[PDB]
Subunit: 208 residues, 2 copies
């Protein structure tokens, strides 16, 4: 039988007024026999009617897949409002309910560190730079790499890991052609989190 | 005063016999006044002596930064052995202790779904493809995108999110030049997790 995902907003979206944060409700494995899906949205238990539902898609193997998107106001997210997606379909024993909201607790500031490539890594076509972040709460965080205003896209950031003091940590690893590192280029790790001043910080790294 | 990170092994490293999983202990903000750092490693409380410690680095602002790496045997990780990093330095009121091990519980299999680009996204220079994974436990998972045997590196995978049944979910979003999608190229989402048969699955996506 059919399956639901309910995804929280992107961290960068809630941190900037210029952006539009949203909650995304996804339904997979709806059968051809009865493709009709019904979405009911609730904010703190009160039904809202401003959600946008995309037209159903007959994706891959016989089944349909349906998306419903709900815009969240920045102030609502911060005030810890709950978003409940209810999905109903004829093949279901009961409607499926999903809920997301902002994590409760005292926000805590990330500490950011950048590490250069190792010695036993200097003799490869490619090298890596490291961005280490810790002490942060909640785990909602955006971490990006960039050089000369161009975003670098060959990086992998680990999931936030729960530390012993209740805060989180992670590393983001950037991979770049050794040539560029050697040439004296500056590379920057941008971090966005609610507990930073201006929701923004940046740490930069170059050779010497 | 000085700060410690203790990172668990990479998910892909523990899932494949051909790889070497390791635990990484990192120390930052050690002062110039007393740069000497001491690492003590323990596996289930018994001290081990096979850790490799790299030479200290005078990175950026006055302070040193030191890394110690411990290899873990695949069978040890699975049997839930605990790895404790103890760091001692003269500027410390007491040694700092960190511990990691494998999450306890019944392993559960990921379900993988791929979604094509939207209609209101067909008229851009670039498009996105989506890889959705859920029902998985533990949260240790590797998710990769690839086309024609070449790894695609312009993707972002969300942190695993805790679902209502105790399992996890996430999406991995691939961004590709529209040209390539239009041309009928096949794109594949590879997923690696202990609960999959052969620790491996793959879902592929192309236009039509």
């Amino acid at each position: 039988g059919p399956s639901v995902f309910l995804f929280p907003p992107k961290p960068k979206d809630t941190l900037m007024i210029s952006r539009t944060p949203e909650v995304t409700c996804v339904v997979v494995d709806v059968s051809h026999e009865d493709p009709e899906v019904k979405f009911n949205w609730y904010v703190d238990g009160v039904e809202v009617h401003n959600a946008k539902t995309k037209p159903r898609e007959e994706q891959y193997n016989s089944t349909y897949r349906v998306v419903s998107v709900l815009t969240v106001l920045h102030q609502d997210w911060l005030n810890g409002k709950e978003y409940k997606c209810k999905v109903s379909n004829k093949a279901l024993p009961a409607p499926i309910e999903k809920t997301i909201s902002k994590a409760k607790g005292q926000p805590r500031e990330p500490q950011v560190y950048t590490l250069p490539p190792s010695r036993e890594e200097m003799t490869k076509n490619q090298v890596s730079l490291w961005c280490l972040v810790k002490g942060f709460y909640p785990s909602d965080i955006a971490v990006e790499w960039e050089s000369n205003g161009q975003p670098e896209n060959n990086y992998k950031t680990t999931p936030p890991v729960l530390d012993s003091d209740g805060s989180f940590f992670l590393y983001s690893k950037l991979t770049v052609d050794k040539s560029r590192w050697q040439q004296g280029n500056v590379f920057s790790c941008s971090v966005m989190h609610e507990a930073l001043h201006n929701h923004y910080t940046q740490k930069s790294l170059s050779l010497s």
